[PDB]
Structure formats: structure tokens, C-alpha cells
Amino acid sequence: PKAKTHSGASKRFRRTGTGKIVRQKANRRHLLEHKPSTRTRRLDGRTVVAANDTKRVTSLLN
């Protein structure tokens, strides 16, 4: 048969132009009142998946 890509991983990770896998960061969905803007801005945007999560994340996306 043909391999099925993991749905949740496909909605939580994507690849960049050079193949890096990126992700957004947790703790920005709610309970934002007490979180100062420095923390929310640290949590904003996308980061490259950690080097030692890379293998499992690639396996999930592939």
C-alpha cells in the first residue's frame, strides 16, 4: 500500500525552502492576561524543530 502521513503532525509542522521543519510555540492560546508581552513575543512566530525531535517529526510528516 501507500504510506499515510500523520494528520496532526501535518497540521503542526511544515517545511521551509531549504527543508528545515518549523513549528509554532505553545502557551499563546489562552490565559494571556498574566503573561507579559516579552513572553508572548518570545512565544510568537515559528521556530525550527529541535535537533533531537527532528527525526521523529520527519518520520511523522513523511
Binding site: 503532525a9 497540521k11 505553545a26
Partner: protein, 96 residues
């Protein structure tokens, strides 16, 4: 991962939606048009499909990477601003 919430569940979904109605353009750059058409002349969607810079049966847009030294008359779909700039600077024309 042994029972802790996995990596594919700890993190939020990527934001946004995908546009069902997105128009995808095959890409040609004036640099590679210069490369494939050194003498210039009429340049068509079919012509540069045939020369292999673009996939067939797709809307193609011209982008402005590279140099243009060729008097070129390129007929594509939805040029780039820099693409028209250097196509006309080389003396050619850029037409939908």
C-alpha cells in the same frame, strides 16, 4: 512517547487556512529566459515550455532574477514588476 502528550499534540496547529481557490503560477526568471533565448525574439508560454523552463498546461509568470541582455518579446501571464522593468530595459516587450 511513553504517555506524555506527544510532540504532535503538545504544539498548536499552524495558524491559518489554505485557499481552495489559490491560483498557482509556474515560475520563469528573466535570467533563464536570457539563458535559453540569447538572440531574443518572440517568447511564448508554449515556447518556454518546449525549451523546458516551465511545466506544461499551467499559468506561468515571469520573475526578475538574473540579467536580461536579449531583445525579447515575452507573452506570459501576470509578469512581475521587476520582470517588466528589465524586459523593457533590454528593449523587449512583456505582454499578457
Amino acid at each position: 512517547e511513553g504517555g506524555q502528550m506527544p510532540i504532535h499534540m503538545r504544539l498548536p496547529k499552524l495558524k491559518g487556512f489554505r485557499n481552495r481557490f489559490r491560483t498557482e503560477y509556474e515560475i520563469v526568471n528573466v535570467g533563464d529566459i536570457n539563458r535559453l533565448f540569447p538572440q531574443g525574439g518572440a517568447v511564448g508560454v508554449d515556447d518556454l515550455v518546449a525549451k523546458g523552463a516551465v511545466r506544461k498546461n499551467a499559468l506561468v509568470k515571469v520573475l526578475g532574477d538574473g540579467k536580461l541582455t536579449a531583445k525579447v518579446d515575452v507573452s506570459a501571464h501576470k509578469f512581475s514588476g521587476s520582470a517588466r522593468a528589465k524586459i523593457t530595459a533590454a528593449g523587449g516587450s512583456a505582454t499578457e
